[PDB]
Ligand binder design. Structure first.
Ligand SMILES: C[C@@H]1CN(C(=O)CO/N=C/c2ccc(OC(F)F)c(OC3CCCC3)c2)C[C@@H](C)O1
Ligand SMILES: C[C@@H]1CN(C(=O)CO/N=C/c2ccc(OC(F)F)c(OC3CCCC3)c2)C[C@@H](C)O1
Ligand SMILES: [Mg+2]
Ligand SMILES: [Mg+2]
Ligand SMILES: [Mg+2]
Ligand SMILES: [Mg+2]
Ligand SMILES: [Mg+2]
Ligand SMILES: [Zn+2]
Ligand SMILES: [Zn+2]
Lengths: 325, 322
């Protein structure tokens, strides 16, 4: 119906993903992954039975928490769809193999599964079982990977059943490398390295990038998914505002637990003392723009419209903050 | 029943650790740990109730597998005692705080707990739940930490209950850093970085190392426990001979599991095609001597005898190659 109409924008930045969630009966991850797999002809390329794909996707989506305001299946679908757009950027045309493409999209799909709605630092500070299990290192991200892969074991869920042994091993490695890179404590290091990759990048005649070793290829995929994960402020203001609502609700809920426990309340987690405009402008100035501006450098001019929206949105949120002229 | 005469060598390289295991009713880890804590006055320094220490040690010791030939409670006891000796080296006099000392010894004690007797690569290749949990990265070492820490939560087991919050946090971080560095896959990088530290070491006149910050200190602790972990070929030969027998028995059993599942048998795990003596020489030539030579540089001349024993032991296995 209208859903197939909205799913026509799947190759477009700014998909009305929230609308798709409503219309699909809260199955945005399932329908968006399925649509993209059909789009990229992935079921045929990797001999994936459709009933298997759908069974896994539905189980995966089930394992995103409905009561978590931001880190849920809608965010997962959004990051999947955004990665799907970035993969098709002209500067990267026929750079990546079908397997690499599959890896980046699957990584995006599972990258926050079973997120509890609180940060790594919170989990470390409250001595959680998760932090105990993972020795305080990329606690959530290791966990997302473990669950995402574990779900492949469920009945009629192995979407990779017809990959070769070599392919499955290569895909597992790439997906691990990608999701671990979504850990924000690795952001400055990724960014610092991506800047250096940009400085010395090599391009063909028709302008596509030359990535001639796994280390360069995976670095580009890591930053790609990281950008997609941090892409909310680059979306039309109507989508962006909605993402901002959810992240602050999730944060304030974390803040509430912290205050109730007598802990120091984490930054931007205090519902009483917090400005949306100030927090978002800071977020953009110190994290999202430094990154997207570097990505735009890498694929210039492919991302200029994305960068323009980001800068517009930044200008928009700073406009109501009083400042010295 | 004593035993006490054996434990008089707890400060020496080449303590009779197998004897201690026998004499103590297979509680070498509890006994040696208890002895070292008393000697270093750690119970008083950190207000560790002695029954809490023993209770934790017995539980920890119970989670090393009796039926694993090498990676068992005797190996843990050995690595603890070896670290205990290395910490007392003159070149390191007054370098470490009591909390750092506590961290290195605790890390040594838990560093292989619940080892199943197969390698990281075997756990990965067989798609074990453990490799699934830890995403193929330092699978065992991540698991050893989780278990060692988890056991503090059993009844009357929290030996760190009277550390401050800041002390617990700092000790936790050091222990994690130290145990993750026992992963053999990190050996070449760790050693490379150790050589770099050695190239630019600072010492007082009496040769005492001057460490500047957490980076320096934890790097020395990591390498120290790694050396202790790889110390078998530097021990008196009779000790070394038994360690060699044990590690081969454990490797062969992994090989047997591999052969049975039609997997390629891992290097040195095929009992039908092994060259034990030749493999010890290569082990020393390519891993153990390059490490201990660098450590010996760091603490010159504290480790000269250790190095000499290493070279004598290399010649033993060389001369027993059929
Ligand atoms: C560098 C760390 C990152 N961080 C995280 O929790 C992990 O990732 N964040 C994702 C994120 C995603 C969307 C956000 O808003 C909108 F785009 F929705 C957003 O805006 C918040 C809202 C207050 C500012 C940060 C954050 C915490 C942060 C304060 O600084
Ligand atoms: C299952 C294996 C695990 N692995 C390791 O490196 C683990 O670390 N080793 C410790 C070790 C400790 C003591 C050894 O001898 C004596 F000193 F005991 C010893 O003898 C080696 C080993 C056979 C000759 C060289 C090894 C390597 C891979 C094939 O898969
Ligand atoms: Mg995440
Ligand atoms: Mg003192
Ligand atoms: Mg080990
Ligand atoms: Mg220094
Ligand atoms: Mg001689
Ligand atoms: Zn995310
Ligand atoms: Zn060990």
């Amino acid at each position: 119906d209208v859903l197939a109409k909205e799913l026509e924008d799947v190759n477009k930045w700014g998909l009305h993903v929230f609308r798709i969630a409503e219309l699909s009966g809260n199955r945005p991850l399932t329908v968006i992954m399925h649509t993209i797999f059909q789009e990229r002809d992935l079921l045929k390329t990797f001999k994936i039975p459709v009933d298997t794909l759908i069974t896994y996707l539905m189980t995966l989506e089930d394992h995103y928490h409905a009561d978590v305001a931001y880190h849920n299946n809608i965010h997962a679908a959004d990051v999947v769809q955004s990665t799907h757009v970035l993969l098709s950027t002209p500067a990267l045309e026929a750079v990546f193999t079908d397997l690499e493409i599959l890896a980046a999209i699957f990584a995006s799909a599972i990258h926050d599964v079973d997120h509890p709605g609180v940060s790594n630092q919170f989990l470390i500070n409250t001595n959680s079982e998760l932090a105990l299990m993972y020795n305080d290192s990329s606690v959530l991200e290791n966990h997302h990977l473990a669950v995402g892969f574990k779900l492949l074991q469920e009945e009629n869920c192995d979407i990779f059943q017809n990959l070769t042994k070599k392919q499955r091993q290569s895909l597992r490695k790439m997906v691990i490398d990608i999701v671990l890179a979504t850990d924000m404590s690795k952001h400055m290091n990724l960014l610092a390295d991506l800047k250096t990759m940009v400085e010395t990048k090599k391009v063909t005649s028709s302008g596509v990038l030359l990535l001639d070793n796994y280390s360069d290829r995976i670095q580009v995929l890591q930053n790609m998914v990281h950008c997609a994960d941090l892409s909310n402020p680059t979306k039309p203001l109507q989508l962006y505002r909605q993402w901002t609502d959810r992240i602050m609700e999730e944060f304030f809920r974390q803040g509430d637990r912290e205050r109730e426990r007598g802990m120091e309340i984490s930054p931007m987690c205090d519902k009483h003392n917090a400005s949306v405009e100030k927090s978002q402008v800071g977020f953009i100035d110190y994290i999202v723009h430094p990154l997207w501006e570097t990505w735009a450098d890498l694929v210039h001019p492919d991302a200029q419209d994305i960068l323009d929206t980001l800068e517009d949105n930044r200008e928009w949120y700073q406009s109501t903050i009083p400042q010295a002229h």
